[PDB]
Design a protein around this ligand. Structure first.
Ligand SMILES: [Mg+2]
Ligand SMILES: [Mg+2]
Ligand SMILES: [Mg+2]
Ligand SMILES: [Mg+2]
Ligand SMILES: [Mg+2]
Ligand SMILES: [Mg+2]
Ligand SMILES: [Mg+2]
Ligand SMILES: [Mg+2]
Length: 175
RNA sequence: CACUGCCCGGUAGCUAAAUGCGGAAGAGAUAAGUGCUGAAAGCAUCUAAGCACGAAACUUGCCCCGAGAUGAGUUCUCCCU
């Protein structure tokens, strides 16, 4: 609707190939591919991407409204990248990356090892910090959630793997 | 012959009180639940398109029966010239 009217201007240095509903986008950071819904039209006059409804579908401007913001993120990923910072709060909590494997120490009797997917590369500058980078926005959101899901941040001291941006609302251990 | 007359021991077999083993791990698709991206609805949103996770239940895996499975299947050999 009000999202699907506004065009996705695709900058130079970015290759865009339309194949029916399949849309590949190649750039210097990577290449990405998504099939659209059957309710969406897509076309291109050399600078802009426009997303129209195919006539006859009731969910026209919502399926075409989703398709704009998906491809608006595919362009940013192949030319800038999406980066997600994660920290650690607590005593003895520390991280370490070996190649593509985060090794966590989070208060358990066993070690914690994570296996980073095929487009995501991780970096611990600090033992209490993870910085991970990737082209696809949906995968850096999913990788960040699986690391936070080992010690979901405590409601008493904020303790555990949290996101960098968020506020963790704390509670007093009351009586 | 007297309850095997009354008793004392005891081979084999059968047995428990004797002594071996078992319930699983793993796989799949989920429940309640938890999320990721994301519009309708410029924001927000687990959901409408798409992606992940999740239980002694479910489907397997473990044991036995099983082609009268009339939908009566397969392989190997033998006999009758
Ligand atoms: Mg007599
Ligand atoms: Mg005896
Ligand atoms: Mg199992
Ligand atoms: Mg599952
Ligand atoms: Mg949104
Ligand atoms: Mg959200
Ligand atoms: Mg049990
Ligand atoms: Mg039942």
């Amino acid at each position: 609707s009000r999202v699907a009217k506004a065009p996705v201007v695709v900058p130079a240095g970015v290759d865009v190939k339309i194949n029916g509903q399949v849309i590949t986008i190649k750039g210097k950071n990577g290449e990405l591919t998504r099939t659209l819904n059957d309710a969406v039209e897509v076309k291109h006059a050399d600078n802009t991407l426009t997303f129209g409804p195919r006539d006859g579908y009731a969910d026209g401007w919502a399926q075409a409204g989703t398709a704009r913001a998906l491809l608006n993120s595919m362009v940013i990923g192949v030319t800038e990248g999406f980066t997600k910072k994660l920290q650690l709060v607590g005593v003895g909590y520390r991280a370490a990356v070996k190649g593509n494997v985060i090794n966590l120490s989070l208060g358990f009797s066993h070690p914690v090892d994570h296996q980073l997917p095929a487009g995501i590369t991780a970096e611990c500058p600090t033992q209490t910090e993870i910085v991970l980078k990737g082209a696809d926005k949906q995968v850096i959101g999913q990788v960040a959630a699986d690391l936070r899901a080992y010690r979901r941040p405590e409601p008493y001291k904020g303790k555990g793997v949290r996101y960098a941006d968020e506020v963790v609302r704390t509670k007093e251990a009351k009586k």
